């Protein structure tokens, strides 16, 4: 219930369970990771999709179990000059295995010239930075894309939302529910002395 009060979104298409039925199914492990990309790069963040930033920084497999939460963020990461802190890596060797981060600083070689630190006509720096100005349009603005991934069959369920507690009714034959212990009866105060672990 504290998910949809975080500004209007930009992309919330999902490839699995409904976002409203997440309370009805209790999970055990959920993953959380976030990054920022240009608004022209939000489209290819999907299971089985190609593009510029599709196979060189972050890839998604066929099994997803979740979806992204992308919204507009132009008054924290946008300056009248530049915002060069965020960058994307596109001069990579080969295909990237999905759900695997990678950090490197060696200069990529696109030819047969052995580059061991130099940047020639074929060797380029593999880390290219963005540029974030108000002069740029809506399709050239940073969006804080965050994706949630769910894991199954590792442990019994431990993570899921509220249980909708209600009031108490006394001296009336009603049905109740106490931590999964169902039954019908009349609630009455006791005189026994329970041990503080039962």
């Amino acid at each position: 219930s504290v998910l949809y009060n975080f500004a209007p979104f930009f992309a919330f298409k999902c490839y699995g369970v409904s976002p409203t039925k997440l309370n009805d199914l209790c999970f055990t492990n959920v993953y959380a990771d976030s990054f920022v990309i240009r608004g022209n790069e939000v489209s290819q963040i999907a299971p089985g999709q190609t593009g510029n930033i599709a196979d060189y920084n972050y890839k998604l497999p066929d099994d997803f179990t979740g979806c992204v939460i992308a919204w507009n963020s132009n008054k924290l990461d946008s300056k009248v000059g530049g915002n060069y802190n965020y960058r994307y890596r596109l001069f990579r060797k080969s295909n990237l295995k999905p759900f695997e981060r990678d950090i490197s600083t060696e200069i990529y070689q696109a030819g047969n010239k052995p580059c061991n630190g130099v940047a020639g006509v074929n060797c380029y720096f593999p880390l290219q930075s963005y540029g974030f100005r108000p002069t740029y349009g809506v399709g050239h603005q940073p969006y804080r894309v965050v994706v949630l991934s769910f894991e199954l069959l590792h442990a019994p369920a431990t993570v899921c939302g509220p249980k909708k507690s209600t009031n108490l009714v006394k001296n009336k034959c009603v049905n109740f529910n106490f931590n999964g212990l169902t039954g019908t009866g009349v609630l009455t105060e006791s005189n026994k002395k329970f041990l503080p672990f039962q």
């Epitope: 300056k79 009248v80 060069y84 802190n85 930075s129």
Partner: antibody, heavy 126, light 109 residues
């Protein structure tokens, strides 16, 4: 842009000095101001950047605690409290303007020093 | 490591002159080289940034280039009334600080 300030007063060894160059004509929350000294007859040495929003600054390999750093968003002017002035500190102090924003240690390679103007005179002398 | 520059540049007017700034393997090539020049008794001013763009305020008169370990700042002739010292700047990841050159002052013959 402008970088006019007042001349720094001469300090004996074992003292404290404060220098600050005025910032106006823009908003002081998007460009990180730098500082550098011009030693006579040789090059320059650098100690770190000042982001004018939060505490994320760093220090160089040769300057650990000899420089202490302080921001001020009410006046939009950075402040400095220099300590342990020796004979190697005798140089004019210039605040170097920078373009863009850089918080980490790998984002300033595209950054270039924008504007220099009217530094102060600092001479450490017994 | 330290960055070295010639103490002075011997340049006759009317002919092309250039300066070299040799550094280290982690200082030049992987990072861009910036050239700075200062007036005598005044503030410095950047000359070349990112090795192929030039700032607004200078005519099409100067050129800068980088080739491996050393970077060259080619100058198309020399004006006798305008002589300034030149600087070389780069970045080193191991030192984690900006490094500046010694300073090359052009001198007429």
């Amino acid at each position: 842009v402008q970088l006019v300030q007042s001349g720094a007063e001469v300090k004996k060894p074992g003292a404290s000095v404060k220098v600050s160059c005025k910032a106006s004509g823009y908003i002081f929350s998007d460009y990180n101001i730098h500082w550098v000294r011009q030693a006579p007859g040789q090059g320059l040495e650098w100690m770190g950047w000042i982001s004018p929003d939060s505490d994320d600054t760093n220090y160089a390999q040769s300057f650990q605690g000899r420089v202490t750093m302080t921001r001020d968003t009410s006046i939009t002017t950075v402040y400095m409290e220099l300590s342990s002035l020796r004979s190697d500190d005798t140089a004019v102090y210039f605040c170097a303007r920078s373009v863009g924003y850089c918080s980490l240690n790998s984002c300033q390679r595209w950054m270039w020093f924008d504007t220099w103007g009217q530094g102060a005179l600092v001479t450490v002398s017994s | 490591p330290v960055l070295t520059q010639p103490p002075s540049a011997s340049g006759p007017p009317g002919q092309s002159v250039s300066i070299s700034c040799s550094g280290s393997r982690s200082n030049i090539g992987t990072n861009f080289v910036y050239w700075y020049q200062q007036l005598p008794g005044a503030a410095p001013k950047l000359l070349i940034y990112k090795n192929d763009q030039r700032p607004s305020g200078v005519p099409e008169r100067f050129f800068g280039s980088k080739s491996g370990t050393s970077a060259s700042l080619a100058i198309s002739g020399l004006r006798s009334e305008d002589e300034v010292d030149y600087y070389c700047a780069a970045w080193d990841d191991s030192l984690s600080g900006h490094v500046f050159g010694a300073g090359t002052k052009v001198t007429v013959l």
